[PDB]
Design a protein around this ligand. Structure first.
Ligand SMILES: CN1C(N)=N[C@](C)(c2cc(NC(=O)c3ccc(F)cn3)ccc2F)CS1(=O)=O
Length: 388
């Protein structure tokens, strides 16, 4: 049974541009669409006109706005934002029926931060205070929500990829998934939930202990899979792998799919590949299994994804086109939105663990499905974690 009907289907979006939830800020409430981001810890909202924003937070119109008299500059590789810190009353209309006083970074200037046509105006960083900007004294939203209300210290995400391109109108009219705040909705997954420990509370850090491509062991020292960390990040599109792991994985995926040759640009995630309508040869592409440390000593479990997760549908014609959604990283493994689309993911902060189950909305075919299976006996799993 599904016990969180009020929160089911409260997300919209897609892997290319992000999944967002409606929120309100200020008095009277100002509605904004906000990116759900498990890879950052600031609640940061557009607060000044921008060519890609149709609306923004207007602090002068909120009677409950409190100015913290402090600026913040946040540069990323992917862009940058500058803002002004304050607090205000915040609600999630399709969430728990509560209003909390939370920190808000009011974005006044930005570079390559906002995405044209994404339909979101801010980011909800759901990770821990350690990585909050400017520092860990800026309490993240979820910490405020738990402290001020009786909402349990857990949230869960079901990101739903359509399996085909959605145009501007369809992506606005379509349900993109669910963010269950304070619980688990059992209608969103099939099979069992398997849990991996949160290694440390900063990002949602986990430990990968084995990687297979179509059941063939990638056979690298497991420290390589987590060099320099492995995280679960709804604010990244792709599955991102450390350089050496990416090189080994692409070699293995090319070998498994060798009956068709794809240009170098496809494997670089830059160029699309197209097939005649309905003829995508899913079967030539391998499944990918990531084994994660279990909660029991010397036990692991695996999550298996299909090419329907790691090939991202894009518009070209009536052809079915895709981009390869696995890419190289110099900051560790990132299990991004395309991986999360295969699973219902439970961020059980209270028990310092992350749960995975097969998603009721994952894209598959009649021959293969995504999977979450276990247990497997795995020794010296702590050695897979990277230090320094
Ligand atoms: C990886 N990153 C992350 N998790 N959060 C940040 C806040 C971020 C995320 C986005 N996310 C996105 O734009 C996005 C796009 C498609 C998706 F499926 C998910 N997220 C945009 C700006 C930004 F600063 C910083 S980042 O280092 O870039």
């Amino acid at each position: 049974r599904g016990s969180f009907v009020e929160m089911v289907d409260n997300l919209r979006g897609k892997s290319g541009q992000g999944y967002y939830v409606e929120m309100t800020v200020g008095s009277p409430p100002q509605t904004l669409n906000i990116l759900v981001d498990t890879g950052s810890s600031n609640f940061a909202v557009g607060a000044a006109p921008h060519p890609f924003l149709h609306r923004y937070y207007q602090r002068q119109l909120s009677s409950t706005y409190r100015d913290l008299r402090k600026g913040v500059y946040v540069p990323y590789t992917q862009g940058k934002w500058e803002g002004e810190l304050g607090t205000d009353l915040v609600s999630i209309p399709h969430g728990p029926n509560v209003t909390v006083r939370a920190n808000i970074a009011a974005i006044t200037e930005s570079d390559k931060f906002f995405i044209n046509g994404s339909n979101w105006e801010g980011i909800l960083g759901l990770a821990y205070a350690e990585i909050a900007r400017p520092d860990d004294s800026l309490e993240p939203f979820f910490d405020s929500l738990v402290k001020q209300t009786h909402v349990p210290n857990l949230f869960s995400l079901q990101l739903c990829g359509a399996g085909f391109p959605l145009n501007q109108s369809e992506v606005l009219a379509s349900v993109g998934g669910s963010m269950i705040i304070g619980g688990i909705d059992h209608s969103l997954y099939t099979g069992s939930l398997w849990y991996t420990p949160i290694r440390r509370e900063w990002y949602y850090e986990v430990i990968i202990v084995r990687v297979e491509i179509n059941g063939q062991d990638l056979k690298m020292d497991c420290k390589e899979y987590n060099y320099d960390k492995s995280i679960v990040d709804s604010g990244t599109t792709n599955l991102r792998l450390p350089k050496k792991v990416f090189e080994a994985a692409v070699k293995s995926i090319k070998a498994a799919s060798s009956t068709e040759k794809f240009p170098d640009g496809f494997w670089l995630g830059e160029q699309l590949v197209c097939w005649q309508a309905g003829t995508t040869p899913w079967n030539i592409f391998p499944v990918i299994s990531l084994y994660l440390m279990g909660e029991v000593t010397n036990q692991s479990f695996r999550i298996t994804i299909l090419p329907q997760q790691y090939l991202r549908p894009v518009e070209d014609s009536q052809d079915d086109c895709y981009k390869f959604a696995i890419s190289q990283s110099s900051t560790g493994t990132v299990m991004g939105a395309v991986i999360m689309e295969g699973f219902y993911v439970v961020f059980d902060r209270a028990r310092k663990r992350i749960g995975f189950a097969v998603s009721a909305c994952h894209v598959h075919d009649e021959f293969r499905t995504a999977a979450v299976e276990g247990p497997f006996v795995t020794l010296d799993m702590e050695d897979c974690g990277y230090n320094i």
